Amino acid sequence: LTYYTPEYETKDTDILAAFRVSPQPGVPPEEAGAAVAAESSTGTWTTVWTDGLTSLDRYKGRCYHIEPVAGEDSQWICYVAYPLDLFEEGSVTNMFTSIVGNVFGFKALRALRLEDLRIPPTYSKTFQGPPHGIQVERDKLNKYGRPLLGCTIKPKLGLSAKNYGRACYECLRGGLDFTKDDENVNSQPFMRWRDRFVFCAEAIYKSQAETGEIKGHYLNATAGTCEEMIKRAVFARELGVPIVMHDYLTGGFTANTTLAHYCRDNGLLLHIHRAMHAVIDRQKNHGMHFRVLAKALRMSGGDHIHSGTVVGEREMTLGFVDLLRDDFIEKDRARGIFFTQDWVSMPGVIPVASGGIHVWHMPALTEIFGDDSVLQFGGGTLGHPWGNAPGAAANRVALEACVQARNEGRDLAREGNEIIRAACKWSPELAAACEVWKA
Amino acid sequence: LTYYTPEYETKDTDILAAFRVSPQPGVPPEEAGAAVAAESSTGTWTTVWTDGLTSLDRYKGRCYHIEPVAGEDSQWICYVAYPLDLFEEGSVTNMFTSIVGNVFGFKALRALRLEDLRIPPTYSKTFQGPPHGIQVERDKLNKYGRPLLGCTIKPKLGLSAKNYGRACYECLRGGLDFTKDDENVNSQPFMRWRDRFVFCAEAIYKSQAETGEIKGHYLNATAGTCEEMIKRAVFARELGVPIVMHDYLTGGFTANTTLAHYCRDNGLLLHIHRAMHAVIDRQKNHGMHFRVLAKALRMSGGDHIHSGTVVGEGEREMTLGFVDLLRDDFIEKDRARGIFFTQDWVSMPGVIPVASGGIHVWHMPALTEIFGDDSVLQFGGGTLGHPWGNAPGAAANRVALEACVQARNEGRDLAREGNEIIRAACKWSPELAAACEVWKA
Amino acid sequence: LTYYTPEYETKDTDILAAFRVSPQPGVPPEEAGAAVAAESSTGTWTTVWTDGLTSLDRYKGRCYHIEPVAGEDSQWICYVAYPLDLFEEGSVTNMFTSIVGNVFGFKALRALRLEDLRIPPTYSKTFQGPPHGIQVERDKLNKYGRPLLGCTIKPKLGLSAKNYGRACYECLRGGLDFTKDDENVNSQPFMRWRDRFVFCAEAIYKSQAETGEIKGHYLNATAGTCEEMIKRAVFARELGVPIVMHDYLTGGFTANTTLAHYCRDNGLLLHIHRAMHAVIDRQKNHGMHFRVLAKALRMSGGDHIHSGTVVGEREMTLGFVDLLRDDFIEKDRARGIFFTQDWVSMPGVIPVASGGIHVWHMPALTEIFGDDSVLQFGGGTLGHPWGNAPGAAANRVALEACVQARNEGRDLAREGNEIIRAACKWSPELAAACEVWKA
Amino acid sequence: DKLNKYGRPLLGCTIKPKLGLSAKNYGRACYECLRGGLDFTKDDENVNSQPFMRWRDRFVFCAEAIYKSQAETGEIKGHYLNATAGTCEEMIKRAVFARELGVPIVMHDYLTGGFTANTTLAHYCRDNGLLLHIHRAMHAVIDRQKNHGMHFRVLAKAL
Amino acid sequence: MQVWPIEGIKKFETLSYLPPLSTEALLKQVDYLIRSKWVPCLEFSKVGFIFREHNASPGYYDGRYWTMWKLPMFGCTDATQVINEVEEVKKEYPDAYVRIIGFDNMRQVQCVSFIAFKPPGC
Ligand SMILES: [Mg+2]
Ligand SMILES: [Mg+2]
Ligand SMILES: [Mg+2]
Ligand SMILES: [Mg+2]
């Protein structure tokens, strides 16, 4: 119908969306695609006289292209173009409201997934973006030429604030750049946030003074209200520490954007955790792919973002890691990049890999993500038989051995086990880590 | 040399500048344009090792087109492209610093004039623009289908605040939409601003109650400091009045943008006066053409801007061109109207142009024809000089305007029939008849 | 006509203006002069009844004197007197609005230039003036008996904030008093202002600790809005650094005056850059001479002001440099001083010379400006073959050699090359600078 | 107790010339007086803020002098920094900066500034731990003649 | 290519980038003060440089003041008198820095400062 316009030339100011559409039986792709377009824009069930007070064509979403999905006889990618004027400047909230607010409940569809968005420069330039971004962060921390290393403190709940800070000091002093608050750790009966912030600050400053290297702890500012979130960031600011944390999907985009602005204004790095993402991004037929949530974070603002474990599909991960880090990313269907994306010098976000990784993963992780990444342990440090500081040292040594080998021209994919084995000869900490975890 | 790149294709994100370049004798046009590009961007008199820490090609202004000027000898139009990344978002101040901060002093140029700027959407979307703009203003004031009418209270200085407000009430009640503070009227010994604001408010509300039409007075918030400027806007807000005023070139762009934000935040219309513009925009060979200053105001923020007198001033097509740049969403390249670049404002609202300076009832047909409805026609002597005083003077102007609008709408040609339209209205309007005997056409 | 009053005795409270008037053919100087006077004051095209509610004579600008310009048969200087009551106290904005707001568009004139203003004491005493001024600045910085030395960092755009601060530290440590933000450097995608302020502060404090001498960097506070300008000054204040910068013509006088007040209240020096001045002050027949813009700056407030290169006309420069620095300046037509100017103890402003200068210019610059000046390099430090710190040392040595020689009674205009040559014998840094730049 | 000074009169010196000096030259004279064994130096009653010595400049250099002399001698030092001003807002701005600098004592001319202002300043000084030195400029206009006016003991009780 | 040193060459503002001034050269600088009708004065210190110990707000530094040696030499017409006092300080305070400053009673300020003696060993 009138919302399927296959001859439309997209404008350089349009927001474009690629939807994976699964229509009900009997519903051709073209009116499914047209329904997505009309339902996520100007479509309404009966005619109305106020339409004649404007030019509706100027606000129509249009489905301008449809292609089949490989391996499916009832799934299509439908491309939809939305005019720039639909969107409130600087608001990820309004961008999602306008595009995914209504159409996922349409009855003629069995399922619907948003795969990708083309964010035009005219729109992305209305956002702050990362408080600092990759390059500024490396300069502030004086850290170059290797992935950054972190550890999440466990048990997440259980410890007193003091015992919690003790574990942080021991991790940091052994060679990790950062320690982190579990996503669940906000403020709770046996560890109130302000107590935790004081002891973690003592730990950060003790470990930095001991090692000579800059240290941080991702202090979780996630809270029930905006007022509490900002109170937490304000105290971190008072303590002079370098980095805070936010759970951006459960706290939400309005709060995240507020926090990103506060962090820009006060020189704080912002570590973003993606709790609840798999509620939305797991199933191939319905929801939103994480690369959409990743672009939205880059716009709303964060300096780090959790990006997986890669220990999903390699090519898809590599795809949205480029979308997070790079200035210009060309369309590349093999890597899940449905649109060419130009960020016109908005800083990039450092991807963070976490979840069940130990020293034997270091070659693969270094090879996959390269230097601009955070490798985040949590079990792989606190599970070392000699304790946290040696566990940290084992991970730092393994990483630096991989970086040295890579820089020398050695292939990490083929020689990683040998690289690690050679380092075990002079690092008893690494040797010990290598016999507990096996491969 | 390396800054002349005639095969360069401009990016949709580039800021483009059109310069009228007058080189010294013996300086080739290509060197001049290259110099304008190098001296308004990266050009440094010796090599520095730090250039090796970056990629300077990325930040170079480029002269990509040069052409001779017909009417002259030794004058060229040079086009320069500037990358988006040079510019601070939302800052007209930085845009001018970057483009016109240094190059006008270059030895190898006899003279330099900036004629036009292509402001790309990617940059203009970082600016609020007008607090309200043409359409919102009409809706707020419930005024449609005609130019708005105003009068500047004179003498600018002399009056007590009370005698000043009396003159406002009598103008407004006679049919003007607005009265205005002269650009020189800020706060002064014999008329302090807060006193003026009180008496002008009394007059606005008295004239509004009497006529049934919404009235305003452009209360000048121009001040020596930002804090003083905002104190004045804050008291206007307290009084509940619709419109304040700023002199954006003499107060400056940093202050003007601050005020524009305040007016958006508090529902105040913002009338912009262009005092001092002719210091920089008068001479054909040096300075900045007004259309550049007009685009900058649209970006920084104003709801009205003074745009000339276009009658007996300057050339018609040039006025018509920058009035389109001020009001329209999309303005196609048109050198006959001094539009050097296609300009796309991506739904930034427009600014109402204001005509002033020495106009009377016999100009009403020509003024209506040239500017059309979306304009303010701003009198002074043409209201306060009526032999029966301010209210009959205002009425004479309002009658003359409505007779012009009626006739236009009926299909009559204002350019050829104006005097006849006016003389017909004199038969039933004693106020207009008395005006027409004093001034002539 | 009635606005040409050649018998008028100027009042000690009048503001006086000297206009260079170029009338249209057929327009005698007297009605041109009278038109300037009436058009920049009470003149209006038709009579009005409200004139009878006051005494217009009391607010009339008057043309009280006319003289021919040397070498011109159609150009005159017209002197106009404006009453004190026309002007809002403390507002440069209103002074320019009232005097140059309207008259430059008058049709009977071909061209018009404002050459000079007599600012009476009654009016200048309503202004703060410089936040500190020459004497206070020398006392605060503990710097006496020589010109101050600075360097503008280049490339203006290109560098990361960190790489930018690196260049600042190397310049400062070699013997410069200051480094400076390019006029274009405010806040931009690859170098956001707050990042730049942090790294420049690290650099200022490292170089000061290394050398033992007080150091500063002119941190540019120029911004799109008053709120942003002040946010930038507030952070400089937090960092405890000595000096900030403003582009006073492009930021504008209302903003500048606000910033000058903030700097007085918080002990910050204010470096003023004059970007865009040549749009106004270049052409001899139209605009405003820089000495007008210079007086206006002294009133609005700044502690330094860019004043040229003198490498224009010597006598005109010397003229407005006196107007900027001295308490009392007698009328002196050879030096472009049209009016005797009495500043009744308002502090002076330090003139800054910049633009393409190197060690061989040091004798001439020292001789022209004397001690109360800033010599600002930018190419002449970053272009030294041994890098920034040696380039700075070369400039500092050349300057001190010139000062020593001058104090000994030697003539810098005649002996400068010998003075510099003698210093090359014991300063390898200077010797190296002297072979790259040649004269 | 605050100054740790017992068993003798305290000693001070008023800097002269009252007007003439740069703020820096003024602070130099303060340092030299204090380092030689005086407890305090003082701002002349006329010294508030004036063209050749603005108050905030004077406060910075006098603070440098107070802290240099205290570090040299080992004894607590102060300078009576004059907060007397044209308005309440300016008077308090001056006391607020003294507070920031951490110095022990400020000054007020209580008869020419007046009692409403003085009482305001006395409260600010209680709330912020500042000593308050009171100068009695203009008292002899009121308290000199035996037959008319007010005796200084009245003005003293009021203070 | 020579590297600018990072240690051992702390500075004392004007003329301290020159080789240390000989007695002849110092005399000429003092003569410049006298000819200018400026008043010479000596200062001295055991600490050579600026620092920040007691406050760090804008324009506040410690170590700007040194200690005055005797009094300004009002009416001095003989540079040798100044240089002699420099030797007296050196005698009483062998490990003190000494500088010569100058007072302008016309613009009412200090207008000169330059190093006369640095203790070797420093
Ligand atoms: Mg977790
Ligand atoms: Mg006017
Ligand atoms: Mg520059
Ligand atoms: Mg006394």
Coordinates of C-alpha atoms and ligand atoms in Angstrom, one line a residue, chain A residues 152 156 180 182-183 273, ligand 1:
Chain A
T152 CA 34.4 -7.8 39.5
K156 CA 28.4 -9.6 45.0
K180 CA 34.2 -3.3 39.8
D182 CA 28.6 -6.1 40.8
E183 CA 25.6 -4.9 38.9
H273 CA 26.9 -2.3 32.5
Ligands
MG1 MG 28.0 -9.1 37.4

